Each structure stands twice: as C-alpha cells, then as structure tokens.
Design a protein around this nucleic acid. Sequence first.
DNA 1: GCAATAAAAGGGCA
DNA 2: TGCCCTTTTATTGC
Length: 183
Amino acid sequence: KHPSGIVPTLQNIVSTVNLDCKLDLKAIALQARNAEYNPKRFAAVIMRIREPKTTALIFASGKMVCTGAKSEDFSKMAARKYARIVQKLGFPAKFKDFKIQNIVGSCDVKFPIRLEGLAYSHAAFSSYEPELFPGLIYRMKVPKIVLLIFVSGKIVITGAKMRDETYKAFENIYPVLSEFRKI
DNA sequence: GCAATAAAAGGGCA
DNA sequence: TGCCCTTTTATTGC
C-alpha cells in the first residue's frame, strides 16, 4: 500500500489500558525505584522501562497511558510490563480495554518543498506561519490526519489510530509535495 | 533548547 | 465547563 515507494517510519505510539483497580500512587512511588511522583505537578506516577523503551503515566483510577513505543505491539508489551510491575507491587491489576490512541510516523521524500505555494494552493487545509513554526501544518480530512511538512522534505504524520491511516495520509500528500518541489 | 502537532489520562483553576 | 497540568516522538530555525 505504498505507491510512492516510501514507507513512513513509526516513531511514537500512545496507548491506554485499564488496570481495572484503584491504585495507591504514593505506595507505588515509594515501593518502586523506577517511579516519579508529585501530585502538585501532575496526577500520575511517571514510570519508565528500558525495553521496549517507554514511559507510562499511572493514575489512581487504575487507568494508564503508555508513550514512546516504536510499534503497536511494542506499546502493548510495554503496557503489559507496567501492569505486571504494578501487580508485583501488590495491586490486583488486570489488563482491559487496551487501545492505541495515537501514532506518530515520519519520513523523508528527499527533495525540497515550496511551503508557501503549497499552503496557498491548499488554504482549506494549510497553516503556514514560519515565524511561529517553520513547518506547514496540513490538516487532512480523509483520513483525519495532521502532517507537518518542512522545506527539507522531511514529513511528520500524526493523529492516527491505525498505521494504515498514517500510510494513506502520506500517499495522499505525495503527489502534492512533488508538485511543489523546490527547484 | 524552544517553537507546534496529535493523543490519552487527572487534579486544579477562573 | 474548558483548558492546562505531564509524557512521548518526529521536525527546522531561531
């Protein structure tokens, strides 16, 4: 499903799961060495494991957010590890409603892009204010994905719940990027 | 750095 | 209510 011949690399996956049990965040932050907590700043225990390299946000409600994985599977594995860490800490954690919430992929078309012309020709979807952010923000409607397009030809694709939406957004924009290649 | 992007979870605030 | 709290990742250019 890659007519362009380029496959965006998945860079970050954000997922959530329900441990399905109330948690004592202070007890976790004290029992765990690999855990940061200060409710004055944020309501979650921030934990990190080395493989898959991720960061979890564990809340008192038993709900948990997993960030930093390079794939959906790796995010699910990381999440299972935190839930087991939580269980070994004494809480009857379960593993329910695991869902992929956001997928960030990036790629390189390897040719310069004329961001102003592209923005202008696609005003309905584009936001280009280089003084604020040097990347053109392309809010695609089908699929509903947001792409950050840079002069260098590097592209950031975010907002997908499935990797296929990521791949399709890239394929949809490729013809457009080529059209505004900077010569 | 740090700017903006997307997304989730919660406590706090006006 | 709503919006930021924090975390992650790619990115260019100040």
